[PDB]
Amino acid sequence: TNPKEGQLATTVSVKNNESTTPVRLLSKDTQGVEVTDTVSYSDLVGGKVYELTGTLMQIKADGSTEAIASASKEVTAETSGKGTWELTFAPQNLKAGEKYVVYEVAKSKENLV
Amino acid sequence: GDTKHEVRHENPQDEAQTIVVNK
């Protein structure tokens, strides 16, 4: 497999919130938030197992981040190398007037390079 | 091969990946 092969597109969602790109929360709806991240993947080695790790980052005004939550899952790429994975973070207390972003990394269980 | 296949999406400005809290 070409080391450069592979794409992850991610869409974050919050339970019982309909907003997207970005998700918007009222200050009252910040306690025990259930964040899902939908990972659309393409050009992964079909039928191979990946360690999918998502990271909920607090993004400060100066562009630096601090990780507040993380979730990892053994997943399998569809045989076509395209498909979808879902990831949900443990319940999180978020802060009013703050901005959060989700990172995603997929590493194959096997050495495919 | 000697290493793992690593695909990352780590874009701090991706709106799709962003939650904004009001107040």
Sort out which chain A residues have CB atoms less than 8 A from B5's CB and list them. 1, 3, 5-6, 44-45, 48, 50, 106-108, 112-113
Q: Quote the minimal CA–CA distance from A82 to chain B in Å.
A: 13
Cα–Cα distance for residue pair A19/A75, rounded to 1 Å: 27
b/e string for A36-66 if b means 16 or more Cβ within 10 A?
bbbbebbbbbeebebebbbbbbbbeeeeebe
Resolution at which this structure was determined, Å: 2.4
Q: What CATH number does domain A7-108 carry, 1.10.20.60, 3.40.47.40, 3.40.50.620, 2.60.40.3930?
A: 2.60.40.3930
Residues 29 to 88 of A: which have CB under 8 A from any B CB?
Answer: 30, 35, 37, 39, 41, 44-45, 48, 50, 57, 59, 63, 65
∠ CA A48-A75-A110 to the nearest 5 degrees? 40
The residue extents of the domains of chain A are 7-108
